[PDB]
Amino acid sequence: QEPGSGIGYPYDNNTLPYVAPGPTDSRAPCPALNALANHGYIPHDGRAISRETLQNAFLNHMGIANSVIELALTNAFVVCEYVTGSDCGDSLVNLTLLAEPHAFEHDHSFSRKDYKQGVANSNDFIDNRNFDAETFQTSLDVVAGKTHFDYADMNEIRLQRESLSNELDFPGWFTESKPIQNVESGFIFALVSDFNLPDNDENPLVRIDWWKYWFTNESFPYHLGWHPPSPAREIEFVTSASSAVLAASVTSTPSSLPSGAIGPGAEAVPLSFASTMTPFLLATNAPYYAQDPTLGPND
Ligand code: HEM
Ligand SMILES: *[C@@H]1O[C@H](CO)[C@@H](O[C@@H]2O[C@H](CO)[C@@H](O)[C@H](O)[C@H]2NC(C)=O)[C@H](O)[C@H]1NC(C)=O
Ligand SMILES: *[C@@H]1O[C@H](CO)[C@@H](O[C@@H]2O[C@H](CO)[C@@H](O)[C@H](O)[C@H]2NC(C)=O)[C@H](O)[C@H]1NC(C)=O
Ligand SMILES: *[C@H]1O[C@H](CO)[C@@H](O)[C@H](O)[C@@H]1O[C@H]1O[C@H](CO)[C@@H](O)[C@H](O)[C@@H]1O
Ligand SMILES: *[C@@H]1O[C@H](CO)[C@@H](O)[C@H](O)[C@H]1NC(C)=O
Ligand SMILES: *[C@H]1O[C@H](CO)[C@@H](O)[C@H](O)[C@@H]1O
Ligand SMILES: *[C@H]1O[C@H](CO)[C@@H](O)[C@H](O)[C@@H]1O
Ligand SMILES: *[C@H]1O[C@H](CO)[C@@H](O)[C@H](O)[C@@H]1O
Ligand SMILES: *[C@H]1O[C@H](CO)[C@@H](O)[C@H](O)[C@@H]1O
Ligand SMILES: *[C@H]1O[C@H](CO)[C@@H](O)[C@H](O)[C@@H]1O
Ligand SMILES: *[C@H]1O[C@H](CO)[C@@H](O)[C@H](O)[C@@H]1O
Ligand SMILES: *[C@H]1O[C@H](CO)[C@@H](O)[C@H](O)[C@@H]1O
Ligand SMILES: *[C@H]1O[C@H](CO)[C@@H](O)[C@H](O)[C@@H]1O
Ligand SMILES: *[C@H]1O[C@H](CO)[C@@H](O)[C@H](O)[C@@H]1O
Ligand SMILES: *[C@H]1O[C@H](CO)[C@@H](O)[C@H](O)[C@@H]1O
Ligand SMILES: *[C@H]1O[C@H](CO)[C@@H](O)[C@H](O)[C@@H]1O
Ligand SMILES: *[C@H]1O[C@H](CO)[C@@H](O)[C@H](O)[C@@H]1O
Ligand SMILES: [Mn+2]
């Protein structure tokens, strides 16, 4: 928000306004990075981003501590080197390369289509990077009519998304990614679980309106009473939430789940790519921004 608005106070005392990305700006498949770039907490053009810039942006403007993004930072730079063909050092070339498929970006996302979702031919690919309202609706439908949801609900959400993607993706494309997705499940609980409820750290409940605002708008739901978590969320909360999602009992089992979908997931570890492997072509679409309505500087 505008610095003088005081909208983030006393949780964030140095805010910057929302600015929609222009056609030439680089955006990510990540709603968090996109919100940060939209505010200029990382570069608005989404290019040339250092680890510390990311660490500070997450800590000071989203209440996400450094520990939470340690592996994500490692993996971002691994993917940068893979996509560009050379070491990116401490300047992430852009946000868009993070949408390299079957890498950090993965199938059965909550709010993005898959790289080969619904394509008529095998060489074809689509926008697996920008927010897709329809896909996100498929996630929200699982918790229709509710204001909050828990770990068991999130487990049902990710299962529905796995089922849908496995059915709709070009044959042979779909590749399950429980470890990465469920870190991201933990991230959702970390950012938009309802810290105003008395037992948030034991049984955190996601506020659906906060989640929808963050994902659809790629900006922060201050207008709905959100603020950065204080103290900042740490990695233990995230991986604990990730484990709890996967441990939750399934009351409705969708068809066409990949083998082993139900049950615990592997711990996320650093990505690695063969020096011989050429990266998949990145989707080239202009960055998404909200238009129904468009956002002002304080939204
Ligand atoms: C340097 C730090 C980060 C990097 C490089 C990063 C990168 C990515 C990438 C490549 C994806 C796409 C995965 C896919 O859905 O196919 C993603 C998704 C996602 N990220 Fe980030 N991320 C970071 C930090 C965070 C943080 C701190 C949060 C929230 C606390 C967050 C929230 C999410 C969520 C919820 C998704 C899933 C979106 C969906 O499934 O539609 N990310 N991130
Ligand atoms: C995206 O953000 C816009 C702008 O903040 C949201 O629309 C506003 O929502 C606030 C409460 O958050 C209301 O007080 C305003 O009346 C709304 N303004 C306008 C212009 O409609 C919008 O709801 C957000 N989208 C989602 C899905 O959360
Ligand atoms: C983000 O960076 C990536 C990596 O450099 C860009 O993707 C490459 O773009 C060049 C054109 O300049 C192509 O020759 C390569 O084929 C692309 N690589 C892949 C794997 O697709 C990407 O264009 C950049 N995006 C933005 C919006 O800045
Ligand atoms: C990205 O750009 C490529 C070359 O410009 C195209 O071959 C791709 O199909 C893809 O195009 C899509 O996104 C761009 C926005 O940059 C639009 O100009 C196209 O209409 C298309 O949606
Ligand atoms: C914001 O400023 C107020 C008043 O000085 C202070 O009490 C609070 O700790 C500040 N918040 C942060 C995150 O520094
Ligand atoms: C989230 O974190 C837990 C614990 O590391 C994993 O089991 C899960 O697969 C996901 O990565
Ligand atoms: C989540 O899981 C990680 C290991 O993947 C732990 O280090 C953390 O304490 C939490 O239980
Ligand atoms: C790990 O931490 C999460 C979030 O605080 C809890 O919900 C879970 O029960 C475990 O203690
Ligand atoms: C990971 O952690 C969660 C939360 O403590 C457990 O529910 C799960 O069984 C796994 O050990
Ligand atoms: C775990 O428990 C649930 C109820 O919470 C059952 O519906 C499911 O079959 C599983 O045993
Ligand atoms: C069991 O409850 C789950 C939520 O955990 C629903 O998704 C499902 O429809 C069934 O009622
Ligand atoms: C039970 O509920 C789940 C989640 O909503 C569905 O994916 C499944 O098909 C069944 O309707
Ligand atoms: C749907 O069915 C699966 C087995 O196919 C169970 O694991 C789940 O608990 C739900 O009843
Ligand atoms: C597809 O499969 C699921 C369980 O695997 C069923 O619940 C459903 O009725 C359909 O046959
Ligand atoms: C389906 O296949 C996979 C092998 O990747 C197993 O992990 C699973 O238990 C099931 O047999
Ligand atoms: C990570 O692991 C891969 C295995 O494919 C290697 O190719 C790479 O050089 C790195 O050691
Ligand atoms: C997005 O742009 C539209 C232009 O009609 C405005 O209505 C809105 O305030 C926002 O700036
Ligand atoms: Mn994806």
Swiss-Prot record:
Record-listed heme binding positions: C30
Active site: E184
Cofactor(s) the protein requires to work: heme b; Mn(2+)
Glycosylation sites: N13, N94, N217, T239, S240, S242, S243, S249, T251, S252, T253, T276, T284, T294
Key word Secreted present: no
Keywords recorded for this protein, A-Z: Chloride, Cleavage on pair of basic residues, Disulfide bond, Glycoprotein, Heme, Iron, Manganese, Metal-binding, Oxidoreductase, Peroxidase, Pyrrolidone carboxylic acid, Signal
Catalytic activity: RH + Cl(-) + H2O2 = RCl + 2 H2O
Residues that bear Pyrrolidone carboxylic acid: Q1
Disulfide bond residue pairs: C80-C88
Post-translational modification: N- and O-glycosylated.
E.C. code: 1.11.1.10
First-level EC class: oxidoreductase
Superkingdom classification of source: Eukaryota
Record-listed Mn(2+) binding positions: E105, H106, S109
Cofactor binding annotation: Binds 1 heme b (iron(II)-protoporphyrin IX) group per subunit.
Sample GO molecular function, one term: chloride peroxidase activity
Family the entry assigns: Belongs to the chloroperoxidase family.
Described purpose of this protein according to its UniProt entry: Catalyzes peroxidative halogenations involved in the biosynthesis of clardariomycin (2,2-dichloro-1,3-cyclo-pentenedione). The enzyme also has potent catalase activity and in the absence of halide ion, acts as a peroxidase similar to plant peroxidases.
Name of protein: Chloroperoxidase
Organism, as annotated: Leptoxyphium fumago (Caldariomyces fumago)
Part of the whole protein covered: 21 to 319 of 373
